Design an enzyme around this catalytic site. Structure first.
Site, PDB file in Angstrom:
ATOM      1  N   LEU A 189      39.884 121.977  28.288  1.00  0.00           N
ATOM      2  CA  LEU A 189      40.570 120.786  28.786  1.00  0.00           C
ATOM      3  C   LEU A 189      41.930 120.611  28.146  1.00  0.00           C
ATOM      4  O   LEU A 189      42.843 120.029  28.739  1.00  0.00           O
ATOM      5  CB  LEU A 189      39.724 119.538  28.526  1.00  0.00           C
ATOM      6  N   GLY A 192      45.680 122.183  21.113  1.00  0.00           N
ATOM      7  CA  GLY A 192      46.449 121.393  20.173  1.00  0.00           C
ATOM      8  C   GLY A 192      46.785 122.167  18.919  1.00  0.00           C
ATOM      9  O   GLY A 192      46.370 123.315  18.765  1.00  0.00           O
ATOM     10  N   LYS A 211      35.309 118.887  20.847  1.00  0.00           N
ATOM     11  CA  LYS A 211      36.542 119.229  20.155  1.00  0.00           C
ATOM     12  C   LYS A 211      36.234 120.356  19.164  1.00  0.00           C
ATOM     13  O   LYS A 211      35.363 120.208  18.293  1.00  0.00           O
ATOM     14  CB  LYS A 211      37.134 118.008  19.451  1.00  0.00           C
ATOM     15  N   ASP A 302      46.323 107.524  13.486  1.00  0.00           N
ATOM     16  CA  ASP A 302      47.102 108.312  14.455  1.00  0.00           C
ATOM     17  C   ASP A 302      46.984 107.726  15.851  1.00  0.00           C
ATOM     18  O   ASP A 302      46.669 108.420  16.832  1.00  0.00           O
ATOM     19  CB  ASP A 302      46.652 109.774  14.437  1.00  0.00           C
TER      20      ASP A 302
HETATM   21  C1  LIG Z   1      47.635 117.727  30.963  1.00  0.00           C
HETATM   22  C2  LIG Z   1      46.534 118.025  29.949  1.00  0.00           C
HETATM   23  C3  LIG Z   1      45.749 119.273  30.340  1.00  0.00           C
HETATM   24  C4  LIG Z   1      47.123 118.148  28.555  1.00  0.00           C
HETATM   25  C5  LIG Z   1      46.050 118.077  27.466  1.00  0.00           C
HETATM   26  N1  LIG Z   1      45.684 116.668  27.240  1.00  0.00           N
HETATM   27  C6  LIG Z   1      44.415 116.551  26.472  1.00  0.00           C
HETATM   28  C7  LIG Z   1      44.222 115.095  26.066  1.00  0.00           C
HETATM   29  C8  LIG Z   1      42.904 114.921  25.313  1.00  0.00           C
HETATM   30  C9  LIG Z   1      41.754 115.360  26.209  1.00  0.00           C
HETATM   31  N2  LIG Z   1      40.470 114.974  25.546  1.00  0.00           N
HETATM   32  C10 LIG Z   1      40.219 114.841  24.218  1.00  0.00           C
HETATM   33  C11 LIG Z   1      38.908 114.407  23.978  1.00  0.00           C
HETATM   34  C12 LIG Z   1      38.308 114.228  22.627  1.00  0.00           C
HETATM   35  C13 LIG Z   1      37.085 114.835  22.324  1.00  0.00           C
HETATM   36  C14 LIG Z   1      36.547 114.714  21.040  1.00  0.00           C
HETATM   37  C15 LIG Z   1      37.226 113.995  20.060  1.00  0.00           C
HETATM   38  O1  LIG Z   1      36.693 113.904  18.779  1.00  0.00           O
HETATM   39  C16 LIG Z   1      36.672 112.751  18.042  1.00  0.00           C
HETATM   40  C17 LIG Z   1      36.901 112.818  16.660  1.00  0.00           C
HETATM   41  C18 LIG Z   1      36.859 111.643  15.914  1.00  0.00           C
HETATM   42  C19 LIG Z   1      36.615 110.421  16.529  1.00  0.00           C
HETATM   43  C20 LIG Z   1      36.388 110.351  17.906  1.00  0.00           C
HETATM   44  C21 LIG Z   1      36.411 111.524  18.651  1.00  0.00           C
HETATM   45  C22 LIG Z   1      38.458 113.422  20.359  1.00  0.00           C
HETATM   46  C23 LIG Z   1      39.004 113.541  21.638  1.00  0.00           C
HETATM   47  C24 LIG Z   1      38.305 114.298  25.329  1.00  0.00           C
HETATM   48  C25 LIG Z   1      37.006 113.900  25.916  1.00  0.00           C
HETATM   49  N3  LIG Z   1      35.961 113.508  25.153  1.00  0.00           N
HETATM   50  N4  LIG Z   1      36.914 113.910  27.266  1.00  0.00           N
HETATM   51  C26 LIG Z   1      37.944 114.276  28.050  1.00  0.00           C
HETATM   52  N5  LIG Z   1      39.152 114.638  27.596  1.00  0.00           N
HETATM   53  C27 LIG Z   1      39.383 114.662  26.253  1.00  0.00           C
HETATM   54  C28 LIG Z   1      41.911 116.833  26.561  1.00  0.00           C
HETATM   55  C29 LIG Z   1      43.237 117.026  27.317  1.00  0.00           C
HETATM   56  C30 LIG Z   1      46.618 118.684  26.209  1.00  0.00           C
HETATM   57  O2  LIG Z   1      47.162 117.944  25.366  1.00  0.00           O
HETATM   58  O3  LIG Z   1      46.538 119.924  26.064  1.00  0.00           O
END
Ligand SMILES: CC(C)C[C@H]([NH2+][C@H]1CC[C@H](n2cc(-c3ccc(Oc4ccccc4)cc3)c3c(N)ncnc32)CC1)C(=O)[O-]
Length: 447
Positions: A189, A192, A211, A302
């Site tokens: 998805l 980073g 993640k 952040d």
């Molecule tokens: C146009 C896009 C393709 C660009 C893309 N955008 C990105 C933006 C973030 C997106 N992202 C990040 C998480 C997530 C998961 C676990 C997590 O862990 C945690 C840790 C600590 C506390 C809470 C959660 C934190 C966040 C996540 C999720 N659960 N569901 C859907 N999308 C998610 C992925 C695409 C990019 O930037 O490449």
């Protein structure tokens, strides 16, 4: 003897579960968080059950129009969601009168457009209920049937209950630290500096996001100590942590959010078209989650639009709360570049490493500007040194087009150079929740 009736359609997903056909009867043995031990008298098979799929047999929680455990603001959002009609309604527990109830009704007028009106349901001393003294009822069902036949002073005749969906099934019991092999990574998805994000399936039966942190980025013991706090931060406007893989490379497993980050969404065809009051509602949802983090004496560290996620139904959920604290600074992470962005960060955090809930408040102001500009970089046309030196001299980003003055005033309060002069998230939540409904009564004073 404690008897409970089922509410939704649920069938076994794990090993020793049961099955539901939108209406059965149970007697719970014991409890265990979101999963309960219950005995069946219908099919006579006994296994664990999702507690949020069942209801207490004497209580109102069986009624299609009763919404347990939701707030006034929740109620408004739910009723204003697409799919509801004029006169759509719910009964909920009262927020300002313990023990009593509130009626929320979807209204429309050409001046104010779509709105939700709220009425106090009073309880009679010797039993029964009323909204207006001239019309009393023995039960809430009688009240609902009465106002479905005619408005009798309400803004609208009641039509149908607020729409709702079957709640998320609870996470598997005792499955906090899980084996890596339990996860099949299906679609990447995002990428980073210090990790990637995947859509995955857990044990072939549950869709999740994962993640995946880069090797060298975190220690297992340090991460786990913090993750054990993170998992307790449960609130509708924070993304839920389900599980972790506590071996390098560390994986963090959360609920999957269909529309990605708020930054992604605001820059998409659908998100770029959200009207200003929806943008303000997004801002309020995030402020509600940050007020919770504030109440819990936690620090995000952040906060920015890239770290807000958006659900299929457009609910905002704060992600990555606390994570920056446990990303290590070493030869491995250094080669990926900057750890935090200067343009989002409070001056005292940059200069002295002072990260607090008040530096999150600064960041929230920057996030508000990201929202109202649909994802523009902060401080357009300025370098990082230029931003720092400008801020020192009292420069702040000017009010952009299509930004209500009161929203900008909230940003400016967030950007006080002295942290103690910035508002609390409790304050911010209150002003944003009531942004349009200020100078208006809480409840309708019905005759
Ligand atoms: C146009 C896009 C393709 C660009 C893309 N955008 C990105 C933006 C973030 C997106 N992202 C990040 C998480 C997530 C998961 C676990 C997590 O862990 C945690 C840790 C600590 C506390 C809470 C959660 C934190 C966040 C996540 C999720 N659960 N569901 C859907 N999308 C998610 C992925 C695409 C990019 O930037 O490449």
């Amino acid at each position: 003897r404690i008897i409970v009736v089922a509410l939704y359609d649920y069938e076994a997903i794990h090993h020793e579960d049961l099955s539901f056909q939108k209406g059965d009867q149970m007697v719970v043995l014991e409890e265990s968080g979101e999963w309960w031990k219950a005995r069946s008298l219908a099919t006579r098979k006994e296994g664990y059950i999702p507690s949020n799929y069942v209801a207490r047999v004497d209580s109102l929680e069986t009624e299609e129009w009763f919404f347990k455990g939701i707030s006034r603001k929740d109620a408004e959002r739910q009723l204003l969601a697409p799919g509801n009609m004029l006169g759509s309604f719910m009964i909920r527990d009262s927020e300002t009168t313990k023990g009593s109830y509130s009626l929320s009704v979807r209204d429309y007028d050409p001046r104010q457009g779509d709105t939700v009106k709220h009425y106090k349901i009073r309880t009679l001393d010797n039993g029964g209920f009323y909204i207006s003294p001239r019309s009393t009822f023995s039960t809430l069902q009688e009240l609902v049937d009465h106002y479905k036949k005619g408005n009798d002073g309400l803004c609208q005749k009641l039509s149908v209950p607020c729409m709702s969906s079957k709640p998320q099934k609870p996470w598997e019991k005792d499955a906090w630290e899980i084996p890596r092999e339990s996860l099949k990574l299906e679609k990447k998805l995002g990428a980073g500096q210090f990790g990637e994000v995947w859509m995955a399936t857990y044990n072939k039966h549950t869709k999740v996001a994962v993640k995946t942190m880069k090797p060298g980025s975190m220690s297992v013991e340090a991460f786990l100590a913090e993750a054990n706090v993170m998992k307790t931060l449960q609130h509708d406007k924070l993304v839920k942590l389900h599980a972790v893989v506590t071996k390098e490379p560390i994986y963090i497993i959360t609920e999957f959010m269909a529309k990605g980050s708020l930054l992604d969404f605001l820059k998409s065809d659908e998100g770029s078209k959200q009207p200003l009051p929806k943008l303000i509602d997004f801002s309020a949802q995030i402020a509600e989650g940050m007020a919770f983090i504030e109440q819990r004496n936690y620090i995000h560290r952040d906060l920015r639009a890239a770290n807000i996620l958006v659900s299929a139904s457009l609910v905002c959920k704060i992600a990555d709360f606390g994570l920056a604290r446990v990303i290590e600074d070493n030869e491995y992470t250094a080669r990926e570049g900057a750890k935090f962005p200067i343009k989002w960060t409070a001056p005292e955090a940059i200069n002295f490493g002072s990260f607090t809930i008040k530096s999150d408040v600064w960041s929230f102001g920057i996030l508000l500007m990201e929202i109202v500009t649909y994802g523009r970089i902060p401080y357009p046309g300025m370098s990082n040194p230029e931003v720092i030196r400008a801020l020192e001299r009292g420069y702040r980003m000017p009010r952009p087009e299509n930004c209500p003055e009161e929203l900008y005033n909230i940003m400016m309060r967030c950007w006080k150079n002295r942290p103690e002069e910035r508002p609390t998230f409790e304050y911010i939540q209150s002003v944003l929740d009531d942004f349009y409904t200020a100078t208006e009564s809480q409840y309708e004073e019905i005759p």
